[PDB]
Specification:
This is Endolysin. Belongs to the glycosyl hydrolase 24 family. The structure is a monomer. This protein is mainly alpha-helical. The protein contains ten helices and three strands.
Length: about 160
């Protein structure tokens, strides 16, 4: 298992513009287009993203291209971030994937706000961090996905994803 396989379990693949759990316009493998209520603003972001007139529909190919850019940008954001970098560097390979997952879902900013859990992860207090992470909007709004990521941090194995 690797970061792409993991995120693809969590995000799914949709080739036509769709709304987020949050009601936001998205496409592909969880590629958020706009937080704006117009399908028209979304379409325009889509064409700008792909470099063609898409009419709200992309190919697999275009979907995976956007996925590659997003994962790359997630990793780079982690590495550029003063709060995130230290925790990332301290972690093993599997747990590294769990933090990447959070960053992809919520952005750098969102995750850098989990102060206390970050602290506990650096300290390698796995059970404690799992309990603290659960106390969030994140867990309450997307419990199955949060629980898969949380187990990953807790155990350091890919078991939550075996099932899936």
């Amino acid at each position: 298992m690797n970061i792409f396989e993991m995120l693809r379990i969590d995000e799914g693949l949709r080739l036509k513009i769709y709304k987020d759990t949050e009601g936001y316009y998205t496409i592909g493998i969880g590629h958020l287009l706009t937080k704006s209520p117009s399908l028209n603003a979304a379409k325009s972001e889509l064409d700008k993203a792909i470099g063609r007139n898409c009419n709200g529909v992309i190919t697999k190919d275009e979907a995976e291209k956007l996925f590659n850019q997003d994962v790359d940008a997630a990793v780079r954001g982690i590495l550029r971030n003063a709060k995130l970098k230290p925790v990332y560097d301290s972690l093993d390979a599997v747990r590294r994937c769990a933090l990447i997952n959070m960053v992809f879902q919520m952005g750098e900013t969102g995750v850098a706000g989990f102060t206390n859990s970050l602290r506990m992860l650096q300290q390698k207090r796995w059970d404690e961090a799992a309990v603290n992470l659960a106390k969030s909007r994140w867990y309450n709004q997307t419990p199955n996905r949060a629980k898969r990521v949380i187990t990953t941090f807790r155990t350091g194995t890919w078991d939550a994803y075996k099932n899936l």
